[PDB]
């Protein structure tokens with residue numbers, strides 16, 4: 091209910107101004123995580139004990155902020171780009187795509 | 195595809211009955227069609243016989259599968275002209291497929 | 298549609314009533330309708346039947362009883378709501 | 390389906406890697422696997438830059454041939470699905 | 483109809499969220515077609531005739547295993563095993 | 568411990584089937600009163616880790632709420648928690 095979850099985000103390399111730098115891909119679905127971390131923190135939020143305590147403290151004292159909705163599982167993508175010398179570099183970048191969101 | 199209801203609008207012009215039926219101009223009759231598999235699920239409202247026949251078909255397919263037919267139907271009002279060109283009002287029972295099943 | 302105007306020109310042959318009120322019954326929440334059927338001989342209306350009509354997509358959300366088909370030999374309309382077939386019109 | 394790709398590395402001497410051969414592709418969990426080719430093209434003269442495996446990428450789904458479809462790029466690229474699919478590559482702007 | 487079941491492949495055409503309701507049993511069925519291509523399906527079975535269907539015939543030409551149960555959603559993670567090859 | 572199945576409502580993961588979720592921890596039901604006095608019910612799965620704290624809850628929470636936990640298949644359905652007395 092406006093709770094912590096994965097949201098759409100397509101990263102278009104033209105919109106970032108990286109068209110001349112990145113040969114492939116043209117962009118990619120990164121996603122992002124957003125939403126409130128309510129009490130209680132449900133199983134699929136994969137919370138730490140600390141996020142659980144902070145959530146409880148926040149419900150007693152609003153000055154302590156709530157836990158935060160962040161990626162807890164991410165996957166890799168391949169990229170091809172041009173370096174300083176105009177040479178083609180291949181890289182598999184880890185942790186580029188949000189697969190799961192949780193409260194931390 | 196499994197036993198289910200399919201669309202069918204009966205237009206009285208199409209069947210050449212415009213001269214005879216003053217109303218309605220036509221109606222959604224629907225029809226039932228599709229395989230009756232093992233097992234026969236709850237919504238197919240099968241008899242014990244259709245269930246046994248489905249199982250016999252499983253053992254030897256020379257015995258046909260049960261068949262997909264209307265198991266619940268509803269009525270429509272019609273106005274038509276009789277043999278003497280007089281108008282007749284009738285509610286026709288069992289005109290519209292409301293549910294299909296295996297029998 | 299709890300009731301409709303009833304008319305049967307054939308009452309004397311059918312051994313029914315000619316004219317009056319007819320309560321409409323319907324199934325498990327299906328709509329109920331009224332209908333009017335008549336002949337127009339050069340301007341002189343001759344009512345044939347009025348009564349209840351079963352749930353019919355052609356009568357849905359109609360408050361007035363209007364024959365829209367072009368000069369038929371037998372005119373017909375159906376509608377929704379109590380006694381809606383009391384008055385009937387013709388707009389080709 | 391994609392278990393191996395043709396491999397090429399023009400920078401092999403600097404990188405201290407291999408130059409040409411076959412590359413096995415490993416996936417995640419139930420992520421697709423792809424091959425890619427990338428090359429330069431000086432007036433009809435094709436100079437291969439890199440070939441190899443490519444991670445799950447929506448731009449490569451259900452592409453059985455490796456074709457560059459962009460108009461006269463300075464560095465040409467294609468990716469595909471299927472064993473050794475980067476072995477031959479084409480250009481159709 | 484007091485029993486709720488998971489359905490896949492045997493859903494009523496008006497199934498809400500792969501769920502069906504019945505007075506009989508939930509079932510899951512694994513079946514091997516002619517080529518060895520096995521499929522899993524599930525749903526609701528009416529009480530009438532359930533004795534026969536839950537039993538099945540071991541002389542069926544295609545190999546399959548059907549399992550029935552009578553508690554809500556006992557169906558969801560039922561994956562029966564094919565008869566001994 | 569278990570392979571535990573729970574009803575979920577308001578706390579469902581995006582891959583829930585039949586409004587159910589699976590967990591190694593507990594099923595819960597919660598009644599809560601929002602900052603406007605509207606009361607709602609919600610249910611779901613809780614990881615075993617941190618469940619001592621969540622099932623206990625804080626009696627000093629600013630909003631009225633009662634969470635109840637259980638560890639039996641779909642036991643979630645039989646939980647009828649009642650809001651705690653208004654703090655005077």
Ligand SMILES: CC(=O)N[C@@H]1[C@@H](O)[C@H](O)[C@@H](CO)O[C@@H]1O
Nearest residue numbers: 337339340341342372385386387
């Ligand atoms: C059917 C009915 O209600 N009346 C119509 C009337 O509107 C029309 O102007 C005239 C044409 O001949 O007579 C018809 O009968």
Ligand SMILES: CC(=O)N[C@@H]1[C@@H](O)[C@H](O)[C@@H](CO)O[C@@H]1O
Nearest residue numbers: 404405406407408409410411412
């Ligand atoms: C990293 C590297 O130098 N590649 C080698 C390759 O030449 C060879 O085919 C094999 C053993 O020599 O596997 C290695 O990965």
Ligand SMILES: CC(=O)N[C@@H]1[C@@H](O)[C@H](O)[C@@H](CO)O[C@@H]1O
Nearest residue numbers: 430432433434435465478479480
């Ligand atoms: C990129 C590649 O593989 N070859 C193309 C070829 O298709 C084309 O005939 C020629 C003229 O545009 O340019 C390149 O040589």
Ligand SMILES: CC(=O)N[C@@H]1[C@@H](O)[C@H](O)[C@@H](CO)O[C@H]1O
Nearest residue numbers: 311312313314315316317318319
């Ligand atoms: C043939 C017929 O059905 N006549 C009925 C009659 O039974 C009823 O008592 C009365 C009041 O409505 O007039 C008619 O409607």
